[PDB]
Amino acid sequence: MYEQLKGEWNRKSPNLSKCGEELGRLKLVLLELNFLPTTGTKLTKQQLILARDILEIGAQWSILRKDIPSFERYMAQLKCYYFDYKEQLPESAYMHQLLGLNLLFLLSQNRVAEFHTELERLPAKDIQTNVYIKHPVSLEQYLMEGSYNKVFLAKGNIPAESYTFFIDILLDTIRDEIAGCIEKAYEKILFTEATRILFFNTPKKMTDYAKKRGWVLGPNNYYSFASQQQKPEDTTIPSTELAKQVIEYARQLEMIV
Amino acid sequence: MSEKKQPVDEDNWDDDNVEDDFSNQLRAELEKHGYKMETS
Amino acid sequence: GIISLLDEDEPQLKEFALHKLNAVVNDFWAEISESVDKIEVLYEDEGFRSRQFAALVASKVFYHLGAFEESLNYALGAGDLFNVNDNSEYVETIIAKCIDHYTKQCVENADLPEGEKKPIDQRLEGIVNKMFQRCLDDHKYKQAIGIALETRRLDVFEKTILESNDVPGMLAYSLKLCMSLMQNKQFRNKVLRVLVKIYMNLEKPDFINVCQCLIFLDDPQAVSDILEKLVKEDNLLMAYQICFDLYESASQQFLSSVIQNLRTDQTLKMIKILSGEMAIELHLQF
Amino acid sequence: PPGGGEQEPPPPPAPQDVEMKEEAATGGGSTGEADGKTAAAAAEHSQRELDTVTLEDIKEHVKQLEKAVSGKEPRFVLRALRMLPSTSRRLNHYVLYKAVQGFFTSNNATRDFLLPFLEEPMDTEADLQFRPRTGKAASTPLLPEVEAYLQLLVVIFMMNSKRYKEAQKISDDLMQKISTQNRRALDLVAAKCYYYHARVYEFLDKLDVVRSFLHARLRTATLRHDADGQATLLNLLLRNYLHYSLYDQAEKLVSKSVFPEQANNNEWARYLYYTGRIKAIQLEYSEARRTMTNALRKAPQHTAVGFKQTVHKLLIVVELLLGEIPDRLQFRQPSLKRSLMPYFLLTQAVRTGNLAKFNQVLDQFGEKFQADGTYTLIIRLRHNVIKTGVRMISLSYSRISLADIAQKLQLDSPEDAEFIVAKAIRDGVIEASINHEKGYVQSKEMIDIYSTREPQLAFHQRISFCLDIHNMSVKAMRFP
Amino acid sequence: VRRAAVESLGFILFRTPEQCPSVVSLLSESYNPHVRYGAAMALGICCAGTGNKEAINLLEPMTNDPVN
Amino acid sequence: LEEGKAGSGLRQYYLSKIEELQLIVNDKSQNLRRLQAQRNELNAKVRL
Amino acid sequence: DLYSRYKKLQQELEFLEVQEEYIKDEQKNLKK
């Protein structure tokens, strides 16, 4: 009961037992009564103040340990607490970077249709202030037109916390797509084109895409084969179904009088 | 029939067909269109 | 957002997650439409604490999708937690299809009496006598007797006529039903002979009963018994009238069969009028 | 009083005559088709509904003193019509009170005694079999009850008198409407109440309680069967969730109730407006702009109404999200003069390669964008600012070098111009291909099998549509 | 055999005589006289002794037929 | 409510059921007399 | 009351389907 609101928050959290205490803290609050009606009564909103705060620090410890199904689990319940119908609910100072964690995660796993419909609930914070939210929507604008390099040159500027566990996934799902463009019929280049297009004068990334992808270095020459299919055709294939369609023509001329 | 979504709503007589195609590209049509010939 | 609570693997979070399921199932319809496999999961455990409730809220969400048999099959797995709730527009619509599925089942089962029938749930008659409990509260038993004719089950037809005492004439009205809109003749005699069982449990015999039943059931010993009863309590008024009605209505070889059961006064009186000679010459006289 | 008081005798008596015979002929003819020919869709139900939208809202707003509409409340305060003598005696009450109100002044309700003059209409031996008469002649005084527009303490009288009607509406749904099926009237009754009940819950707290009711209301509709019931209640349920600026659209994506299947040319046109906006916000631009086109060309039959100018408002944006734009201001109005100037000058800057003007007129006309509810153009149309030219070039040229498209798109760099062309072909903007061997960007092939293989895949729909016209003609032919 | 079809209508429908003028309304207006003949007897045996005036309305062109 | 609880329980089952049974009988009669007059045209052709 | 109304609407519905089937045959027959 009232279990360590700032117990191991500030300095370090190498805990696994306080994770079970946080697990018991979930068994405390969500077994008190409920959170569903929320009519009035600031006194029964007082545990709703703490239920937000324990899921915020639960989302803090989730990205501290990189659990992917858990991070969407805590954030959905946090978003359900900003889905409160009677929101008196004073502004927790962690909200803008917490949504920025959600805005960056849901950008990273290719929910781009879910990205822009998420942006409806933000009235004017995108323009006036709020660089926690302004940075991923400036990031998505950089993905719009043609500008790959402005993403990677704004890599060395995050005003928030480190964001590294998302942007490692976010750039990896960029790299394989450009790799997916170069694994087409674009036959052969050298390492300096993999330096220009992909990035990175020599790390072991050339070892990374030698084993993941193909790209064997020959006599100072890479190799990527033809991914073009044969396109088997007959073009008299619909001869059955076109013979079907004309049957229900006369079937709908006769027989229904 | 009100549908509850209403509430707001040669001078230029056939202008927009001309204007969507050509806007303001030196319309005297002589100073460059007829005057390429100093280059050759 | 409470599907996130369904992801975690402890039981005391499940029962507060499913308590919030049916609370907002009427307003958050299609959110559960993707978590269907999670519930039909949670359902298949035999160690889960509220698996019959999972059949309720699955029946709620297939009711939104229009999958009516899926709500039906999970109402079968719902246990008593479904039918303990009775005042809703939800509950009356999927017991409507349950009666509809059951009454077309027994018409199919009436075609094959020799085994090979279907295994049948028993809450579908637990709502029949519950509807009879409503009819106990109603005084109007004309509605529970309607399904009782349709369900092809006759002991509940006997239980509803050996009910709390309100007329024998209601049963007579039901008997009309057997003259107007009764279609089959195979179980018609069974309905028509279970009426004369309670008539012999009743204190007064009628006219239109044996004028309908026993000429459609050709039992000559049965009218020879019940008229011997009418002789026995010294009632030669209505025994005299039913012989003239039997001589007008019934056919040859049945009057010959019953007059054998006569000898098996007032006896010679009913010799002469079941031969029916005197009715002819007075009709000849007019 | 010598000026206007002498012009007080002309306004009552002909609206005391011909506006009175409106519902007298409507209430008589609706009863005539409710009794015999119980399929009563083809009557003056439709034209009175077109009148109750148009005519009787502007025929009267106030109760029209010297007893034209002021008399309607003491006229219909005494309505039994119960048995044949109770009909014929009320037919005498249709004679006597209309003679008194045509002559003298009857019981004038002073705008707040209208609800006790809605009690004895519901009271005084009123019937359940005359459920069109109760449903229509209670909802039709609610429009003078709402369009008085004073909006003070009548708003709760709005709230009471609708739930008076809706308690009768739900009880009619529970008490088994034999062969009339008032749902054909009760759909737009459920609309006209909930247009202003949505206003009331904009003047007070939120209208999710309406949606919890309307979910149960959509449940009892079409589980019975649909007779315009699923069509009306769905656009009502969709509008609040679109009106709320919360997330609210993936709720509509999973809304699998997409079959109203007929809408009498009026619900379907606005239904395609709402779902066209929905498919536009999840960035599917191709299917959105063609069903927005279908919504604009389906029901425009008005006189400068505004929502036609609103479906024309959103249609030009998604076409600027795919490049093409037609003539827009060729149907200019006294009110379209306000709303042509931002959007015509918007696509003026889009077609040219100017972005400083594009950012200037965003700053100039952003507050007009606030009134239209279209902030999101600045974040998603700056994509097509660079993509309009590459759509224009690849349609003009046939086999272009990437070294020349850099100056033509004035990008001043051939190395990233590969990636803009790569993104457009990734998005399917142009179907062309790239030769990454010496710098060629060639277009598609010639006109294909279009003359041979395609056209039957257009012909199959036109067979099926036209014989269904022949089928819907023949089936609905002979009423006598 | 076509007559004994349309003659057997009154044997199966005499209990409810109201349906019989509705169903033999166009059976009396075929092209062969044999169907029209058994149509006429079907009015005679479905409705036994009623003052119907609907079947009598049907029988008035039936007694004014070209065929004897 | 002796009758009121049961008018929604054991009568609302019947009267909601006979509603659509009333609609189709209403529907086919419009369909039948249409078929009647279409047959009366073709018989008027062949007999003439 | 209500059970007799439900049986008669069952009967009349299956009745005029049969007389609908008769006119389907005759209009098909008069074409030949």
Swiss-Prot record, chain A:
Give the signal peptide as a residue range, or say none if absent: none
What processes does the entry annotate via GO biological process terms? proteasome-mediated ubiquitin-dependent protein catabolic process
Which residues constitute the cross-link Glycyl lysine isopeptide (Lys-Gly) (interchain with G-Cter in SUMO2)? 204
The alphabetized UniProt keywords are: Isopeptide bond, Phosphoprotein, Proteasome, Ubl conjugation
Q: Which residues carry this modification: Phosphoserine?
A: 13
Q: Does the keyword Lipid metabolism apply?
A: no
User: Domain of life here?
Assistant: Eukaryota
One GO cellular-component annotation of the UniProt record comes to: nucleus
Q: Does the keyword Ubl conjugation apply?
A: yes
Q: Which residues does the UniProt record annotate as the domain PCI? A: 69-238
Q: What is said about its interaction partners and assembly?
A: Component of the 19S proteasome regulatory particle complex. The 26S proteasome consists of a 20S core particle (CP) and two 19S regulatory subunits (RP). The regulatory particle is made of a lid composed of 9 subunits including PSMD8, a base containing 6 ATPases and few additional components. Interacts with DDI2. Interacts with TASOR.
Q: What does this protein do?
A: Component of the 26S proteasome, a multiprotein complex involved in the ATP-dependent degradation of ubiquitinated proteins. This complex plays a key role in the maintenance of protein homeostasis by removing misfolded or damaged proteins, which could impair cellular functions, and by removing proteins whose functions are no longer required. Therefore, the proteasome participates in numerous cellular processes, including cell cycle progression, apoptosis, or DNA damage repair.
The record's comment on protein family reads:
Belongs to the proteasome subunit S14 family.
Task: Tell me what this protein is called.
Answer: 26S proteasome non-ATPase regulatory subunit 8
Q: Which organism is it from?
A: Homo sapiens
Q: What is the lineage of its organism?
A: Eukaryota, Metazoa, Chordata, Craniata, Vertebrata
Designated gene of the protein: PSMD8
Q: Which residues of the full protein are shown?
A: 94 to 350 of 350
UniProtKB/Swiss-Prot annotation, chain C:
Segments crossing the lipid bilayer: none
Q: Which domain of life is it from?
A: Eukaryota
Q: Where do the coiled-coil regions begin and end?
A: none
Job of this protein: Component of the 26S proteasome, a multiprotein complex involved in the ATP-dependent degradation of ubiquitinated proteins. This complex plays a key role in the maintenance of protein homeostasis by removing misfolded or damaged proteins, which could impair cellular functions, and by removing proteins whose functions are no longer required. Therefore, the proteasome participates in numerous cellular processes, including cell cycle progression, apoptosis, or DNA damage repair.
Summarize the subunit comment: Component of the 19S proteasome regulatory particle complex. The 26S proteasome consists of a 20S core particle (CP) and two 19S regulatory subunits (RP). The regulatory particle is made of a lid composed of 9 subunits, a base containing 6 ATPases and few additional components including PSMD1. Interacts with ADRM1. Interacts with ZFAND1.
Instruction: Name the family.
Output: Belongs to the proteasome subunit S1 family.
Q: What is this protein called?
A: 26S proteasome non-ATPase regulatory subunit 1
Q: Which organism is it from?
A: Homo sapiens (Human)
Tell me the part of the parent protein that is shown.
Answer: 7 to 341 of 953
From Swiss-Prot, chain D:
**Alphabetic keyword roster:** Isopeptide bond, Phosphoprotein, Proteasome, Ubl conjugation
> Which residues lie within the region annotated Disordered?
1-52
Covalent link location (Glycyl lysine isopeptide (Lys-Gly) (interchain with G-Cter in SUMO1)): 21
Q: In its UniProt record, which GO terms are filed under biological process? A: proteasome-mediated ubiquitin-dependent protein catabolic process; regulation of protein catabolic process; ubiquitin-dependent protein catabolic process
Q: Which residues carry this modification: Phosphoserine?
A: 401, 413
- Stored Pfam families: PCI, Rpn3_C
Describe the location of the PCI domain by residue ranges. 269-448
* Glycyl lysine isopeptide (Lys-Gly) (interchain with G-Cter in SUMO2) crosslink location in chain: 21
Under InterPro entries, the record lists:
26S_Psome_reg_C, CSN3, PCI_dom, TPR-like_helical_dom_sf, WH_DNA-bd_sf
Q: Which PANTHER family match?
A: 26S PROTEASOME NON-ATPASE REGULATORY SUBUNIT 3 (PTHR10758:SF2), 26S PROTEASOME NON-ATPASE REGULATORY SUBUNIT 3/COP9 SIGNALOSOME COMPLEX SUBUNIT 3 (PTHR10758)
Concerning its family, UniProt says: Belongs to the proteasome subunit S3 family.
Known function: Component of the 26S proteasome, a multiprotein complex involved in the ATP-dependent degradation of ubiquitinated proteins. This complex plays a key role in the maintenance of protein homeostasis by removing misfolded or damaged proteins, which could impair cellular functions, and by removing proteins whose functions are no longer required. Therefore, the proteasome participates in numerous cellular processes, including cell cycle progression, apoptosis, or DNA damage repair.
Q: What is this protein called?
A: 26S proteasome non-ATPase regulatory subunit 3
UniProtKB/Swiss-Prot annotation, chain G:
Q: Where does it reside? A: Cytoplasm; Nucleus
Q: Out of the domains of life, which is the source? A: Eukaryota
Where are the annotated coiled coils located? none
For this chain, the family text in UniProt reads:
Belongs to the AAA ATPase family.
Q: What does this protein do?
A: Component of the 26S proteasome, a multiprotein complex involved in the ATP-dependent degradation of ubiquitinated proteins. This complex plays a key role in the maintenance of protein homeostasis by removing misfolded or damaged proteins, which could impair cellular functions, and by removing proteins whose functions are no longer required. Therefore, the proteasome participates in numerous cellular processes, including cell cycle progression, apoptosis, or DNA damage repair.
Q: How does it assemble?
A: Component of the 19S proteasome regulatory particle complex. The 26S proteasome consists of a 20S core particle (CP) and two 19S regulatory subunits (RP). The regulatory particle is made of a lid composed of 9 subunits, a base containing 6 ATPases including PSMC4 and few additional components. Interacts with NR1I3. Interacts with PAAF1. Interacts with TRIM5. Interacts with ZFAND1.
Stated name of the protein: 26S proteasome regulatory subunit 6B
Part of the full-length chain shown: 39 to 70 of 418
